[PDB]
Amino acid sequence: EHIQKVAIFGGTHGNELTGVFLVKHWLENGAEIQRTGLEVKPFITNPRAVKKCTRYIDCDLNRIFDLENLGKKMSEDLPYEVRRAQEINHLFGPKDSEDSYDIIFDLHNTTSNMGCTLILEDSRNNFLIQMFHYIKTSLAPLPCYVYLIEHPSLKYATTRSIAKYPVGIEVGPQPQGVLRADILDQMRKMIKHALDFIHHFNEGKEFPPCAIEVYKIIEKVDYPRDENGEIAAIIHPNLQDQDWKPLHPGDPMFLTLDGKTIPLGGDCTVYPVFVNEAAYYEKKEAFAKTTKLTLNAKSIRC
Amino acid sequence: EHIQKVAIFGGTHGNELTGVFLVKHWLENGAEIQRTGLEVKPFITNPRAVKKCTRYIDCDLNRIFDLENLGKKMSEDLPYEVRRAQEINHLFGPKDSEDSYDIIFDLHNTTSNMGCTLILEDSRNNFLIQMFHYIKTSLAPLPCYVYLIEHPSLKYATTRSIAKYPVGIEVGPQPQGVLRADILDQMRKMIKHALDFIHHFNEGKEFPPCAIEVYKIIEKVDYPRDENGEIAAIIHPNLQDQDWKPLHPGDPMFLTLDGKTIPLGGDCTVYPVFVNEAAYYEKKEAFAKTTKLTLNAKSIRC
Ligand SMILES: [Zn+2]
Ligand SMILES: [Zn+2]
């Protein structure tokens, strides 16, 4: 097919505000993002987790947009976010369906020092790459990065995963529960400018094939825990606020409260991402180790 | 008068962690905090809120160490905090009584870029002013700004106020539930000078008269609201991260998504503190407006 329905989701993580704020307005006086040809839909996904201003109320709405969850049946009892992903399947989905959106945006914010981050789901996404390639470009001088989740497994449950062509937008760093006017713009640069690439492409303009060499999630790093339970050695003052950068074998990683360091394994370079992210602390996670692995595509016309 | 009982409270609020980690580490080895001729019991105040990375369970434990709560007898219906408060007032109390603990340091991290902050409740009171001075100088050459809560009423409700000499230790920026090697180091050093301090004083060190620059809250400034009540504007950009620095009448104080700027007002200089604190949306306030006033202490000697 072609294009059609477009969405901007804000509120999947209720206490990620610069990703959320804007939407509340684009329901109030949405004139701020509607163009002369293209069609974009702004929607707040987890209203209740927004109001409290809290990651979630029953379960991560961001890990339940798939069979596994979507498929479960009607019980006013069920965990709030479930029934929510379900219904969400009617407005912009269902997922894997046909009438369901092809361009939705799942806006977020992190605590790790990451700056502009576009998230790619499957690698074989010729288009998405032209875009993830046409965003990085339309961005300079302000830095932008592409994160890839290559599930060999081959299955996603994300909120944005209802659309033909999903796109994750994340901006760091913005403490959960806070709203920095700076982050409310450290990112406006692709949206209303993306709402563009999702129109202009139509004219059938073409660019040479594509190969964004991204950083791909390959293995999450654990927190060196003491004994009884509690931590032992935390993110070192050298890795801190160093996402997307190399971490060779000497590079410190974890610093113990008694003063010691704990360096990197192997001898191959990596660019840690999601360094010291608030959420995932209950997961005993310090960061995701990444190899700046490659991504070639193919040219595209409309 | 010679000091004997000294407790370092941490985990007071659940998001804040530098103290949960520090306290615990000492609870296993206070060598760094033990002093000759003193007793320093590190203690976690809100065990539970620490487990559900909440700011708490029922309500804040930094607002109930007063006669209304203190006048309640222990029970089931009695909510968690009210219950725990007592146990601390039992353990480190009863209150305003000499029967209780001498000095208590309670640690707190903030999302505002404010660095090393000492919190004093009442100014006129020569005892606890020299201490802060010794810290300002011993912790140098990094700001170690001091914040005041002058209550002409002459009253306080901080978990730390059980002590005959309450001392607040706040440090930012270190997101809620995300511990940074660095932040933990500033506080680590603040505590040193403070513990050691009591040590040479206890061992009769004489001290000459001194004075300290401080900031008094003079107007909790709020974020603009909406038609009904929603947050219209927000903290301004150029102000973000400028806690403690000078704010004149016509300088940017806020902003609105339609690019609009809202100015300060009044006819004098103010020093915004707690500029964009995560808990402030909840404790309401875009930032605290304060005056820099001088406190002059008399020379003390044990
Ligand atoms: Zn998120
Ligand atoms: Zn606190």
From Swiss-Prot, chains A, B:
Brain white matter, skeletal muscle, kidney, adrenal glands, lung and liver. Zn(2+) binds at residues 13, 16, 108. It is found in: Cytoplasm; Nucleus. Changing residue 8 to T: In CAND; <0.5% residual enzyme activity. GO terms for cellular component: cytosol; nucleus. It is an enzyme of class 3 (hydrolase). Changing residue 170 to Q: Abolishes enzymatic activity. Its main location: cytoplasm. InterPro entries: AspA/AstE_fam (IPR050178), Aspartoacylase (IPR016708), AstE_AspA_cat (IPR055438), Aste_AspA_hybrid_dom (IPR007036). The record marks 55 as: Transition state stabilizer. Changing residue 170 to A: Reduces activity by 99%. Pfam families: AstE_AspA_cat, AstE_AspA_hybrid. Changing residue 162 to T: In CAND; 5.5% residual enzyme activity. It is linked to Canavan disease: A rare neurodegenerative condition of infancy or childhood characterized by white matter vacuolization and demyelination that gives rise to a spongy appearance. The clinical features are onset in early infancy, atonia of neck muscles, hypotonia, hyperextension of legs and flexion of arms, blindness, severe mental defect, megalocephaly, and death by 18 months on the average. HAMAP family: Aspartoacylase (MF_00704). This is Aspartoacylase. It comes from Homo sapiens. The lineage of its organism: Eukaryota, Metazoa, Chordata, Craniata, Vertebrata.
